[PDB]
Amino acid sequence: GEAVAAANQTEVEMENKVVLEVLFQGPDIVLTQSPASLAVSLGQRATISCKASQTLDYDGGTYMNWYQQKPGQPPKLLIFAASNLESGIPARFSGSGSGTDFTLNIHPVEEEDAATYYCQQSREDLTFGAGTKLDLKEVMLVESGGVLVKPGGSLKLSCSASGFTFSRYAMSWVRQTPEKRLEWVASISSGGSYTFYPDSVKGRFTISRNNAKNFLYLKMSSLRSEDTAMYYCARSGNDYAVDYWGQGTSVTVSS
């Protein structure tokens, strides 16, 4: 019943009233994204490739998503379910592919398309390609905050939802390392009954939500320096795409 954040996460759902904390142990789907960097001139084509370690074909859909990210901002959804153009996104972005091979094509490249692009799969939890920084050979100010914490410590992050029925949507936290890698760290089902985590945060991170007050939380304890990252809350929309990202809050764990 309850909405989850990736296709495999449905298979825990229970008729008995149960609350489940889940760690899937199957082999993780690795996304190999290429090239890491490229620079083109205005009007040209940019072709970015993503190869998955196993097929994303799945009768319900092919859950390949593409995001654009500019400095100081959360990623923005461009393409969902391999080839669908997200509403509001310019038609110069198109996604294609099947099985294990996926392609983001940008043509004609425009000055505002200089950004880092990421592929992402929602078939087996959530994993991301390492990103592609696209360079080209309206005044905006965007703020965020951050803290320093010592190892072994704990922190609680929060996020607010409005303008939609929060209780209908799965929610997740994704963090971004200093090396700009995106790593999913937790998801929670729409009704709060099922929570999901990767191995890297097991026993230490807790995602929770309050559907009456429209809050999402992440509690992090036994913090390690490898938890240093910008932490984003985000909604699962159609086809397990991550379609609304809150601004990041930064966490630096240093002794």
Short mmCIF file of C-alpha atoms in Angstrom, two decimals:
data_model
loop_
_atom_site.label_atom_id
_atom_site.label_comp_id
_atom_site.label_asym_id
_atom_site.label_seq_id
_atom_site.Cartn_x
_atom_site.Cartn_y
_atom_site.Cartn_z
CA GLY A 1 0.00 0.00 0.00
CA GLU A 2 2.30 2.74 1.25
CA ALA A 3 4.34 4.62 -1.33
CA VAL A 4 8.05 3.81 -1.22
CA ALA A 5 11.10 5.35 -2.88
CA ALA A 6 12.32 2.51 -5.10
CA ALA A 7 10.79 -0.49 -6.81
CA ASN A 8 12.41 -3.18 -4.65
CA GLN A 9 11.13 -1.47 -1.51
CA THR A 10 7.55 -2.58 -2.26
CA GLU A 11 8.34 -6.20 -1.57
CA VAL A 12 8.45 -5.73 2.24
CA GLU A 13 4.96 -4.30 2.42
CA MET A 14 2.80 -6.19 4.87
CA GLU A 15 -0.89 -6.69 5.52
CA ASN A 16 -0.24 -7.17 9.24
CA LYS A 17 0.29 -3.84 10.92
CA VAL A 18 4.08 -3.87 11.17
CA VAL A 19 6.72 -1.16 11.40
CA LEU A 20 9.87 -2.25 9.59
CA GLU A 21 13.43 -0.93 9.45
CA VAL A 22 14.90 -2.42 6.28
CA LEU A 23 18.41 -3.10 4.95
CA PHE A 24 18.45 -4.74 1.53
CA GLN A 25 21.60 -6.86 1.13
CA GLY A 26 21.39 -7.73 -2.57
CA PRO A 27 24.24 -6.60 -4.79
CA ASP A 28 24.03 -2.86 -5.29
CA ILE A 29 23.39 -1.53 -8.78
CA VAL A 30 26.45 0.45 -9.80
CA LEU A 31 25.95 3.27 -12.31
CA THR A 32 29.04 4.03 -14.42
CA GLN A 33 28.57 7.54 -15.77
CA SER A 34 30.78 8.98 -18.46
CA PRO A 35 32.53 11.22 -19.32
CA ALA A 36 33.40 12.72 -15.92
CA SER A 37 33.96 16.16 -17.49
CA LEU A 38 33.39 17.77 -20.86
CA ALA A 39 33.38 21.23 -22.36
CA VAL A 40 31.45 22.19 -25.49
CA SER A 41 30.57 25.44 -27.26
CA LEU A 42 27.14 27.05 -27.42
CA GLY A 43 24.70 25.34 -29.73
CA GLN A 44 26.58 22.04 -29.78
CA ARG A 45 25.45 18.64 -28.47
CA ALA A 46 26.41 17.10 -25.14
CA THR A 47 25.99 13.32 -24.83
CA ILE A 48 26.29 11.78 -21.38
CA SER A 49 26.19 8.06 -20.83
CA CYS A 50 25.24 5.84 -17.94
CA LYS A 51 25.85 2.09 -17.78
CA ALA A 52 24.15 0.08 -15.04
CA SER A 53 25.75 -3.07 -13.58
CA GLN A 54 22.45 -4.88 -14.12
CA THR A 55 19.38 -4.24 -16.18
CA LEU A 56 16.88 -1.67 -15.08
CA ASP A 57 14.14 -3.30 -17.17
CA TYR A 58 11.16 -3.95 -14.94
CA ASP A 59 7.57 -4.40 -16.13
CA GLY A 60 6.30 -1.47 -14.06
CA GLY A 61 8.93 0.78 -15.64
CA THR A 62 12.60 1.53 -16.29
CA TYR A 63 13.59 3.65 -13.33
CA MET A 64 16.43 5.74 -14.73
CA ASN A 65 16.41 9.41 -13.71
CA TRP A 66 18.66 12.35 -14.68
CA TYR A 67 19.38 15.43 -12.56
CA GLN A 68 21.07 18.74 -13.14
CA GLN A 69 22.93 20.47 -10.32
CA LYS A 70 24.46 23.94 -10.14
CA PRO A 71 26.68 25.28 -7.34
CA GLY A 72 24.91 26.09 -4.09
CA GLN A 73 21.67 24.39 -5.19
CA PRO A 74 20.07 20.98 -4.78
CA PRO A 75 19.83 18.78 -7.86
CA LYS A 76 16.85 19.29 -10.17
CA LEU A 77 15.00 16.47 -11.94
CA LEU A 78 15.29 16.58 -15.75
CA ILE A 79 14.24 13.16 -16.98
CA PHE A 80 12.36 10.34 -15.30
CA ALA A 81 11.67 6.73 -16.26
CA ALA A 82 14.59 6.86 -18.77
CA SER A 83 12.93 9.06 -21.43
CA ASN A 84 10.13 11.23 -19.94
CA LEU A 85 10.78 14.98 -19.86
CA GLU A 86 9.93 16.45 -16.45
CA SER A 87 7.36 19.25 -16.65
CA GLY A 88 8.95 22.69 -16.91
CA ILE A 89 12.25 21.33 -18.29
CA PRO A 90 13.37 22.56 -21.74
CA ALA A 91 12.90 20.14 -24.61
CA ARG A 92 16.59 20.39 -25.45
CA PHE A 93 17.06 17.74 -22.73
CA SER A 94 16.19 14.21 -23.78
CA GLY A 95 16.92 10.87 -22.20
CA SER A 96 17.03 7.52 -23.90
CA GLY A 97 18.16 3.97 -23.43
CA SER A 98 17.13 0.47 -22.35
CA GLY A 99 18.38 -2.41 -20.25
CA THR A 100 21.73 -1.34 -18.89
CA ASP A 101 22.57 1.52 -21.31
CA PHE A 102 21.21 5.03 -20.89
CA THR A 103 21.98 8.38 -22.48
CA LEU A 104 21.26 11.99 -21.65
CA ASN A 105 21.46 14.22 -24.75
CA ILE A 106 21.55 18.04 -24.53
CA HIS A 107 21.15 19.88 -27.79
CA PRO A 108 21.54 22.71 -28.46
CA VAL A 109 23.63 23.38 -25.36
CA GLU A 110 22.91 26.84 -23.93
CA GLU A 111 24.93 28.98 -21.55
CA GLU A 112 22.59 28.14 -18.64
CA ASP A 113 23.22 24.40 -19.14
CA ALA A 114 26.70 24.60 -17.60
CA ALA A 115 26.14 22.35 -14.58
CA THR A 116 26.88 18.88 -13.21
CA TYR A 117 24.57 16.11 -14.42
CA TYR A 118 23.85 12.82 -12.65
CA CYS A 119 22.14 9.60 -13.56
CA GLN A 120 20.27 7.71 -10.87
CA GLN A 121 18.43 4.40 -10.65
CA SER A 122 15.42 3.66 -8.46
CA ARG A 123 15.10 -0.03 -9.32
CA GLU A 124 17.16 -1.34 -6.38
CA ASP A 125 17.12 1.30 -3.65
CA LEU A 126 18.73 4.53 -4.98
CA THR A 127 22.21 4.85 -6.48
CA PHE A 128 23.77 7.61 -8.58
CA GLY A 129 26.37 7.91 -11.28
CA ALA A 130 29.47 9.81 -10.28
CA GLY A 131 28.36 12.87 -12.25
CA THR A 132 29.40 14.78 -15.39
CA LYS A 133 30.57 18.36 -15.13
CA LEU A 134 29.53 20.18 -18.32
CA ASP A 135 31.34 23.45 -19.04
CA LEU A 136 30.89 25.93 -21.89
CA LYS A 137 34.17 26.65 -23.66
CA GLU A 138 19.26 36.71 -14.09
CA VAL A 139 20.63 37.56 -10.65
CA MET A 140 20.20 34.81 -8.08
CA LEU A 141 21.29 34.38 -4.47
CA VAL A 142 20.86 30.95 -2.88
CA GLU A 143 21.69 30.32 0.77
CA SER A 144 22.33 27.31 2.95
CA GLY A 145 23.67 26.57 6.42
CA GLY A 146 26.04 24.11 8.01
CA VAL A 147 27.60 22.95 11.26
CA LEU A 148 30.82 21.40 12.53
CA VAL A 149 30.53 18.33 14.74
CA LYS A 150 33.07 16.07 16.40
CA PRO A 151 33.18 12.33 15.69
CA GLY A 152 30.89 10.20 17.82
CA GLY A 153 28.38 13.03 18.06
CA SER A 154 24.78 13.23 16.92
CA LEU A 155 22.60 15.63 14.91
CA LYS A 156 18.98 15.97 13.84
CA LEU A 157 17.98 17.50 10.51
CA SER A 158 14.48 18.52 9.50
CA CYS A 159 12.42 19.47 6.49
CA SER A 160 8.93 20.90 5.93
CA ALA A 161 6.43 20.09 3.19
CA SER A 162 3.61 22.25 1.85
CA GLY A 163 1.43 22.59 -1.22
CA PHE A 164 0.79 18.85 -1.55
CA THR A 165 -0.55 16.00 0.57
CA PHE A 166 2.70 15.10 2.35
CA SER A 167 1.25 11.85 3.69
CA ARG A 168 0.86 10.52 0.16
CA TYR A 169 4.58 10.61 -0.73
CA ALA A 170 7.66 8.62 0.18
CA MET A 171 10.54 10.85 1.32
CA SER A 172 14.28 10.44 1.40
CA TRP A 173 17.56 11.99 2.47
CA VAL A 174 20.41 12.11 -0.05
CA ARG A 175 23.81 13.50 0.87
CA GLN A 176 26.56 14.93 -1.31
CA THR A 177 30.19 14.33 -0.37
CA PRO A 178 33.02 16.84 -0.75
CA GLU A 179 33.91 15.00 -3.98
CA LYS A 180 30.36 15.83 -5.25
CA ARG A 181 29.16 12.24 -5.08
CA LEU A 182 25.46 11.80 -4.33
CA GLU A 183 24.65 8.99 -1.88
CA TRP A 184 21.17 8.01 -0.80
CA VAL A 185 21.13 7.57 2.98
CA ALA A 186 17.49 6.87 3.98
CA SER A 187 13.92 6.55 2.71
CA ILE A 188 10.59 6.39 4.49
CA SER A 189 7.26 5.17 3.14
CA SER A 190 4.33 7.56 2.82
CA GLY A 191 2.62 6.29 5.97
CA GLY A 192 5.85 6.00 7.93
CA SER A 193 5.61 2.21 8.40
CA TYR A 194 8.71 1.23 6.39
CA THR A 195 12.17 2.77 6.53
CA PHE A 196 15.10 1.87 4.30
CA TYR A 197 18.83 2.49 4.62
CA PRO A 198 22.06 1.60 2.87
CA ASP A 199 24.74 -0.38 4.64
CA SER A 200 26.94 2.70 5.15
CA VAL A 201 24.60 4.29 7.75
CA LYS A 202 23.05 1.15 9.29
CA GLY A 203 22.38 1.38 13.01
CA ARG A 204 23.31 5.09 13.04
CA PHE A 205 20.83 7.07 10.91
CA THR A 206 17.10 7.25 11.59
CA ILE A 207 14.61 8.74 9.15
CA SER A 208 11.19 9.65 10.57
CA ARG A 209 8.21 11.83 9.63
CA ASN A 210 5.17 13.54 11.14
CA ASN A 211 2.31 13.43 8.65
CA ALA A 212 -0.02 15.64 10.73
CA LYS A 213 2.58 18.42 10.97
CA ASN A 214 4.25 17.81 7.58
CA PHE A 215 7.79 17.33 8.89
CA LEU A 216 10.57 15.02 7.78
CA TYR A 217 13.51 14.23 10.09
CA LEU A 218 16.93 12.63 9.92
CA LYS A 219 18.64 11.68 13.17
CA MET A 220 22.32 10.91 12.82
CA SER A 221 24.37 9.47 15.68
CA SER A 222 27.89 8.02 16.06
CA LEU A 223 28.89 10.52 13.39
CA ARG A 224 32.05 9.70 11.42
CA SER A 225 34.23 11.93 9.28
CA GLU A 226 32.99 10.03 6.25
CA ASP A 227 29.50 11.44 7.07
CA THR A 228 30.77 14.89 6.09
CA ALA A 229 28.35 15.98 3.39
CA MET A 230 25.56 18.29 2.34
CA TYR A 231 22.29 16.61 3.33
CA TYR A 232 19.18 17.01 1.13
CA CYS A 233 15.60 16.00 1.90
CA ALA A 234 13.63 14.99 -1.12
CA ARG A 235 10.31 13.66 -2.33
CA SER A 236 9.66 10.58 -4.45
CA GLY A 237 7.21 11.61 -7.17
CA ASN A 238 6.07 9.60 -10.18
CA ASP A 239 8.08 6.52 -11.19
CA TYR A 240 10.37 6.75 -8.13
CA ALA A 241 11.96 9.91 -9.49
CA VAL A 242 13.23 12.36 -6.86
CA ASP A 243 11.27 15.38 -7.97
CA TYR A 244 11.35 18.00 -5.16
CA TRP A 245 14.59 18.56 -3.26
CA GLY A 246 14.92 20.80 -0.28
CA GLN A 247 17.94 22.99 0.11
CA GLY A 248 20.88 21.16 1.60
CA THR A 249 22.19 21.65 5.09
CA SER A 250 25.90 20.97 5.52
CA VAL A 251 27.46 18.61 8.08
CA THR A 252 31.24 18.56 8.64
CA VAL A 253 32.45 15.82 11.00
CA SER A 254 36.02 16.61 12.03
CA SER A 255 38.13 15.74 15.05
#
